[PDB]
Design a protein around this motif. Sequence first.
Motif, PDB file in Angstrom:
ATOM      1  N   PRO A 192      17.694  11.463 -38.336  1.00 28.10           N
ATOM      2  CA  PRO A 192      18.024  11.418 -39.764  1.00 28.10           C
ATOM      3  C   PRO A 192      19.514  11.171 -39.954  1.00 28.10           C
ATOM      4  CG  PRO A 192      16.677  13.358 -39.251  1.00 28.10           C
ATOM      5  CD  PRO A 192      17.120  12.762 -37.937  1.00 28.10           C
ATOM      6  N   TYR A 204       9.451  16.054 -49.123  1.00 28.44           N
ATOM      7  CA  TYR A 204       9.000  14.966 -48.265  1.00 28.44           C
ATOM      8  C   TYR A 204       9.893  14.846 -47.032  1.00 28.44           C
ATOM      9  CZ  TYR A 204       6.588  10.546 -47.361  1.00 28.44           C
ATOM     10  OH  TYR A 204       5.816   9.545 -46.827  1.00 28.44           O
ATOM     11  N   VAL A 249      21.647  22.642 -42.500  1.00 26.79           N
ATOM     12  CA  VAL A 249      23.028  22.225 -42.722  1.00 26.79           C
ATOM     13  C   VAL A 249      23.732  23.153 -43.709  1.00 26.79           C
ATOM     14  CG1 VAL A 249      24.544  20.393 -43.516  1.00 26.79           C
ATOM     15  CG2 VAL A 249      22.471  19.829 -42.228  1.00 26.79           C
ATOM     16  N   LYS A 294      11.401  16.974 -45.391  1.00 20.40           N
ATOM     17  CA  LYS A 294      11.105  17.996 -44.394  1.00 20.40           C
ATOM     18  C   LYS A 294       9.943  17.596 -43.492  1.00 20.40           C
ATOM     19  CE  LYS A 294      10.369  22.964 -43.799  1.00 20.40           C
ATOM     20  NZ  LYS A 294       9.074  22.879 -43.063  1.00 20.40           N
ATOM     21  N   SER A 295       8.897  17.031 -44.088  1.00 19.04           N
ATOM     22  CA  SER A 295       7.714  16.633 -43.332  1.00 19.04           C
ATOM     23  C   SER A 295       8.011  15.488 -42.363  1.00 19.04           C
ATOM     24  CB  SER A 295       6.579  16.239 -44.280  1.00 19.04           C
ATOM     25  OG  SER A 295       6.139  17.355 -45.034  1.00 19.04           O
ATOM     26  N   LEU A 296       9.128  14.802 -42.586  1.00 23.09           N
ATOM     27  CA  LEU A 296       9.505  13.665 -41.753  1.00 23.09           C
ATOM     28  C   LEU A 296      10.489  14.064 -40.658  1.00 23.09           C
ATOM     29  CD1 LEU A 296       9.849  11.065 -44.631  1.00 23.09           C
ATOM     30  CD2 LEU A 296       8.011  11.168 -42.927  1.00 23.09           C
ATOM     31  N   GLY A 297      10.738  15.363 -40.534  1.00 20.53           N
ATOM     32  CA  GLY A 297      11.608  15.870 -39.489  1.00 20.53           C
ATOM     33  C   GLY A 297      13.060  15.985 -39.916  1.00 20.53           C
ATOM     34  N   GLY A 298      13.338  15.675 -41.178  1.00 21.67           N
ATOM     35  CA  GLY A 298      14.692  15.757 -41.694  1.00 21.67           C
ATOM     36  C   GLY A 298      15.223  17.179 -41.736  1.00 21.67           C
ATOM     37  N   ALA A 299      16.540  17.310 -41.848  1.00 21.67           N
ATOM     38  CA  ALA A 299      17.167  18.622 -41.914  1.00 21.67           C
ATOM     39  C   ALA A 299      17.207  19.136 -43.344  1.00 21.67           C
ATOM     40  CB  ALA A 299      18.569  18.558 -41.347  1.00 21.67           C
ATOM     41  N   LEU A 300      17.164  20.456 -43.495  1.00 14.12           N
ATOM     42  CA  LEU A 300      17.343  21.077 -44.798  1.00 14.12           C
ATOM     43  C   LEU A 300      18.824  21.311 -45.037  1.00 14.12           C
ATOM     44  CD1 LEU A 300      14.553  23.832 -44.698  1.00 14.12           C
ATOM     45  CD2 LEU A 300      14.351  21.386 -45.168  1.00 14.12           C
ATOM     46  N   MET A 301      19.357  20.753 -46.116  1.00 16.39           N
ATOM     47  CA  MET A 301      20.770  20.932 -46.426  1.00 16.39           C
ATOM     48  C   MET A 301      20.979  21.610 -47.778  1.00 16.39           C
ATOM     49  SD  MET A 301      21.580  16.860 -46.703  1.00 16.39           S
ATOM     50  CE  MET A 301      23.302  17.176 -47.054  1.00 16.39           C
ATOM     51  N   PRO A 320      16.138  21.491 -38.825  1.00 20.57           N
ATOM     52  CA  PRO A 320      17.577  21.746 -38.717  1.00 20.57           C
ATOM     53  C   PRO A 320      18.128  22.236 -40.050  1.00 20.57           C
ATOM     54  CG  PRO A 320      17.015  19.580 -37.806  1.00 20.57           C
ATOM     55  CD  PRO A 320      15.798  20.084 -38.543  1.00 20.57           C
TER      56      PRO A 320
END
Lengths: 257, 257, 257, 257
Positions: free
Chosen positions: B192, B157, A194, B159-166, A192
Motif C-alpha cells: 500500500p 474497503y 499508522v 482494510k479488506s485489501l490489506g491496507g494499513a489503518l491510519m 498495520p
Amino acid sequence: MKYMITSKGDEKSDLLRLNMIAGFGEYDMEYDDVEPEIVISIGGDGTFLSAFHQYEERLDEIAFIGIHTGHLGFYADWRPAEADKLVKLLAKYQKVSYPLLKTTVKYGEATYLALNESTVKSSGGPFVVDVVINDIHFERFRGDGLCMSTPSGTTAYNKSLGGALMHPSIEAMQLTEMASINNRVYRTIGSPLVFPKHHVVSLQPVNDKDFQISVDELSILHRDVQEIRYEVSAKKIHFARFRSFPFWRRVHDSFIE
Amino acid sequence: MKYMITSKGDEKSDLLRLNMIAGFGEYDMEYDDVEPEIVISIGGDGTFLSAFHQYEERLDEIAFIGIHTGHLGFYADWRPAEADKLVKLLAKYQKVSYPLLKTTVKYGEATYLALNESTVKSSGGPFVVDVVINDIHFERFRGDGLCMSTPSGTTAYNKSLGGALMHPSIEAMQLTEMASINNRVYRTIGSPLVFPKHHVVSLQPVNDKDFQISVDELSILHRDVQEIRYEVSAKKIHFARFRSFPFWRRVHDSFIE
Amino acid sequence: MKYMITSKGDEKSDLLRLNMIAGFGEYDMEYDDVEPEIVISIGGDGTFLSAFHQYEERLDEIAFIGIHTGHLGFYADWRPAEADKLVKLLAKYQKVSYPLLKTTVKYGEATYLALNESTVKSSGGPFVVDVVINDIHFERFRGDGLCMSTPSGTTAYNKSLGGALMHPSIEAMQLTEMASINNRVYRTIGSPLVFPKHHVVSLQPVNDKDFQISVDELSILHRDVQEIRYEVSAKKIHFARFRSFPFWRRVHDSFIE
Amino acid sequence: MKYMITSKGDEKSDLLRLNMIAGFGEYDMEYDDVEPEIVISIGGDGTFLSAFHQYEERLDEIAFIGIHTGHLGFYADWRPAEADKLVKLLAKYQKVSYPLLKTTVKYGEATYLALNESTVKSSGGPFVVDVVINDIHFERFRGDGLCMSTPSGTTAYNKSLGGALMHPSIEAMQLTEMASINNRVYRTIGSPLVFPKHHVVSLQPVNDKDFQISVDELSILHRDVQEIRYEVSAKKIHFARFRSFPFWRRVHDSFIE
Ligand SMILES: NC[C@H]1O[C@@H](n2cnc3c(N)ncnc32)[C@H](O)[C@@H]1O
Ligand SMILES: NC[C@H]1O[C@@H](n2cnc3c(N)ncnc32)[C@H](O)[C@@H]1O
Ligand SMILES: NC[C@H]1O[C@@H](n2cnc3c(N)ncnc32)[C@H](O)[C@@H]1O
Ligand SMILES: NC[C@H]1O[C@@H](n2cnc3c(N)ncnc32)[C@H](O)[C@@H]1O
C-alpha cells in the motif's frame, strides 16, 4: 566546514573515500570526525545506518549524505561516479529532514533513536504482550513479534511484513505484526497501524519479561523489562541534497526497475 | 440552529427520528433539510455516507453526527439510547474534522468527494492502467483494480485489501491493490502507498478506456476516460462531538471486542 | 490393551487422569508407559505434541487420542466430560492416520519427525539460504526464516504466515516464508508452496552456517550445518476415533465460532 | 494421427502454424479439427485455454501441447524454434495428466470444466453467500468474491489472491477469498483452503441471487441461482510431453528469472 567520511571497508569504498578527502584538501574543508557538520557515508544503507548512530548525539548539527558503492540504497542514493561533483557542491545546498522514532525501555530507563525501525521479539518464545495506545488497552498480541517503523523505514523491514510505504514528509510511525496468532480466542487487529505525532504506543509484558529488542542494526537482549514505549521522535535527521531525487522515484528504482 | 435528520428507513430508525424531532420541538431548533447546520444520521455508516453526499455542497457549514440503530459504526458512533442526551447538547459542542479525497475524471471533466474511498475496476477486464505520481510514471498495474482511501476510510474497503489503518488526524490518502498480477514480466509495488497533501496520483488507460469507478456507495461506469486524478481534498468533513470517543478505541470496539 | 496417560500437569488434568485410570481399572487395561498401544493426552495440543514426541519411536503401534481441559484443540478434540465414555469405547474403534514431515540435517546427519512443522531461522541474522527442489535451484531466500508444515499443521504456525489450510487426507507438505526481502535484486516466490510425496526440498547455507531449527515445540541451535532436507515422511500418526469430528468442522469451531 | 492447430491470430503465430502443417504434410498426419487426437496451441496460455474449451467434450481422446510465441506460459511451455522438432516427435511421446475443476450451477442445472479456476462475484454488490463444505455450514462470506482453482491454476488468478502454489500431481482444489470483510460481527477463515477429491464445496445465496460467474476466460452472468457446487473433476486433461520440463522449474522461470 568540518566533515568526516565513513566507508563500508571494502577496497572500492576505501579508495573512493581517500579520493574525496584529497579533493576536499583542495578546499577549506577541515576533516574532523569529532564534531563534523558534514557526514558522508560510502557503502550501503547499512553503512549509512552506522554513520547515523555514530553521531545520533549531534543530529541537529549534521547534514548526512550517502554514496552507494553497491546497489541503489534509500539513504545512499548518490552514485560513486558523482563523487567529484559532490566534493564541489559541499564546499559552497539545501537540507531535507526525515522523522525519527523514539523508543523508551523501562526496567525495575533507556532511550534510543531509530532511522528505520525498532522491533520486539521474545527470548525463546512464546511472545505475549499487551498493546496500549494513549493509555487505552488496544489488544493482547500473540505471535513472533512487532515492528515499529519510521516513514523512511517503511521501505525496509516494515515492507517485508506487509506494511504500507509512506512518504517521509509525513510525521508518523507504523506498527506491523509478525506471525500473529488469531483464534476465536486470541485476537489482533491484523492490519498495520499508522500513528501521528504525540501518540504513544506502549508494549507491556504478560508472562515472560525478557525481550530481544532492536533499533536498526542494533539488537540487544533486555532483561526485567516493564514497558516499551514508541512515539515519533522530536529529533529529525537532516540530509544534504544537491539534486532532486523524489522518494517515489527512489521507490520505483528500488522495487520496480 | 437549523437541523435535519435522515433515517435508515426501518421501523426502529424512523421512530427514533420522530422522537428527536419532537424533543427538538421543545427548543428553538428549526427543522430545515435545505440549509441545515446540523445533520443527524440514524442507521449505519451506509446511512451516514448518504447523508454526507446529500450535502457535500455545504460541508463547511454542516456538523455531522451519526446514531447507530444496528452495530457500532465508525461515523454512527452514538448509541440510540443517547438520543435524548443528544437533543439537549445540540441545543446549547466542539467540532472534529476529517480529511476527504478529491477524485477528478477527465474525458475527451468531473470531480467528486469521498468520505471512505474511490475505486477503479474494468468493465469486463482485463484491467490495465499506468500509475503516475507527481508526473513521474511509477508502475503499470495489471489486475482487478485499485483503491484510494481517506484516513477514516482505511477501516473500510481499504482494510479488506490489506491496507494499513491510519489515524484521521493525518492529512493523507492511501492506495491499495486488487489482485495484482506480478510476473518476471509485469511488476507492481505490491505494498500500500500513503501520500501526503499536494501529492497527485494519476491513473492512465493503456488499452481499454472504460472503467467502473466508485466513490463510496456511488458506482458509475465511465466511458472515454482519459485520466483519473486522486489527491487529498482541500475540503474537510466536520463532526459534532459531545463526548470523547477515540479513533483507536472505535477501532478496538469494531474489530477486537 | 496396554495404555498410558500424560497430563498438562494442572489440577484439572491430573485429577481427570486419575479418574480415567480408575475407570480403566474396572477393565482389563494394563497401564504401561513403556510399550502402550493407547496413548491418551490430557491438556492442550501442546500436551499432545509432547505425547507424540515421547513415543515417535513406536508410531505404528500406537493410537493417539487427545482430551482438552482448556480450549478446543485440533489434536485434543474430545471434551473432558466425555472421559467416562472414552474409557468404555477404548476397552472394546477405528483409526485415522495423518501424514508427517521428515526433516534431515547434515553436518560436516540427524533426522526428526514433526506433527506440526519444522522451521529455520538464523542465529543473529541475516538469514540467507538457497532453496533447492528435487535438485533444481529454485530461489535464494533472504529474510527471517522458512516454515515447512504438515497437513494437520497448516492450522498452526503455517496459518499465521499466510499459508493455506489443507485437509490432512492429502499427503503433502507446505512451505511458507517469514518476512522475505524482495528487491529488484533479491527475489523469492512469495507464495506458499505445496509439495506432494517424494518431492525433496533442500535448504543450503550461503554465508553463515548456524541456524535455529525447530520441529514442533523442540527448538535446537545447530552448528556447522551443510543441508536441511524436507520431505513427506513415510511414517504416519494414528488416531483412535470414537465419533465423527470432521476436520473442516474442527476448523470452523476453532476459527469461526 | 488426426491433428489440429489453433493460433493466437497474429502474424507470428499464423505463419508458424502454416509451417508445422506443411512439415506435418511430409508425414501421415491427417489434419482434422473435428475429431483430432493431437491439439496444438500456438500463442499464449490464453490461446491454450481456448483450445482446451473448444474440445472439452473429448478430453480423454486428446493430447494437448502448447507453443508460446510471446512470453513463457505454463501450458504453452515450448519455444517457437522447437516447432520442427515437435512435428517430428508427434509423428512417431508420453502423456501427462492434470486435475480439472467441476462446477455445477443450479437454478429454479448446468456444469462446466475449468483448467485454471472458477470465480464468483456479485452483479452490483454487495456479495454475500453461505459457504457449505460436505453439507456442513462453514462460514458466511462477505466481500468481493471467491476463487476456486485447480492445481495448474494456482499459478494464475489464485496466486494474485495470496493462494498457495500446489503441484499439479496433487488431485485437489483451492479456495481463496476476494477482499473479505472481517468484523467482530462478520467472520471468514481468511486463509486459502485446499480440498481433496470427493469434497464438495457449495456456495448458497443469502439475499441477492444473481452472480457473475466465470470459468477460465468464460464469464457469464447467471440469474436465479440457487447453488454453486465445486468439486475436483473426474475428467483430466492430457498433455503430450516430449521433454522434461518440471513444474517447479516452470514456476522458477515464470516468477524468479
Ligand atoms: N541493516 C539493518 C536493517 O536490515 C533490515 N532488515 C532486517 N531484517 C529484514 C527483513 N527480514 N526484511 C527486510 N529488511 C530487513 C532492517 O530494516 C534493519 O534496519
Ligand atoms: N456502503 C459503502 C461502503 O462499503 C464498503 N465496502 C465495499 N466493498 C467492501 C469490501 N469488499 N470489504 C469491505 N468493505 C467494503 C466501502 O468502504 C464503501 O464505502
Ligand atoms: N506448541 C508448539 C506449537 O506452537 C505453534 N506456534 C509457534 N509460534 C507460532 C506463531 N507465531 N503463530 C502460531 N502458532 C505458533 C507451532 O505450531 C508449534 O508447533
Ligand atoms: N485468460 C484468462 C485467465 O486470466 C487469469 N486472470 C484473470 N484475472 C487475473 C488477475 N487479476 N490476476 C492474475 N490472473 C488473472 C485467470 O487465471 C484466467 O483463467
